[PDB]
Amino acid sequence: DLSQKQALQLALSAREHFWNTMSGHNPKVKKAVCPSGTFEYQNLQYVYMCSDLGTKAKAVNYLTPIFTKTAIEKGFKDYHFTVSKGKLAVPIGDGDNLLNWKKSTAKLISKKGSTITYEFTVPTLDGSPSAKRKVTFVKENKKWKVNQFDAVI
């Protein structure tokens, strides 16, 4: 029971959360302070998350609205988060807005019980050949949420 127009709103929602999570700050929270400092672990350079996302619990509270609980476990693992001096840290990285999700198109791939998956064809600002991104939606609590962290971007 999830439409195409609604799914893009959720997918564009995960896009927002993923970027901000990876940047270390929810831009809406203007009262935040971002700890200076870099370190090396696992051959990765790490940086400190801003105050609003400073603890894993604050991170988990940020995302449980759009991402299933399992997506958040795997995400904290996949993107190699770590805690130093009591503050969460991320490996330094950059984002890419090449995919224009706002002008995407969604085609329903599956609907079986509590799980729904849609295929998105995304135009590129680049003029590049457009991209196939499959997003799976699973209903946690009663809310439809995305079941993988990096689904959008």
Added chain:
Amino acid sequence: SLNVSKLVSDAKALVGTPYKWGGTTTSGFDCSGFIWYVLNKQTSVGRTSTAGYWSSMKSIASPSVGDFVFFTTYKSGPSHMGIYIGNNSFIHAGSDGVQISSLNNSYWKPRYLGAKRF
């Protein structure tokens, strides 16, 4: 200071690897890591953001092969980068993957910020 023959060839082989934030591995890269991965094949270098590589690299006006080119995509300032591979082309790591793109494309060219060299 580097074998440009090795840099451009070492990069080109990786075409088709996908995209991941902070990706320093052959299983997924970003602007910063793709250059980091290709660079550490020859010499030991530290991991930084596209903004860091902009500020830790020596200034030039016109790219030669092996130089680094910078673009403004998602934010003001350097937010995406690649290597100049000749012609008017550059190899970079983007959402759809590692790609070859030319500097006379309508997205990149207005947003070509400048070039900085190792």
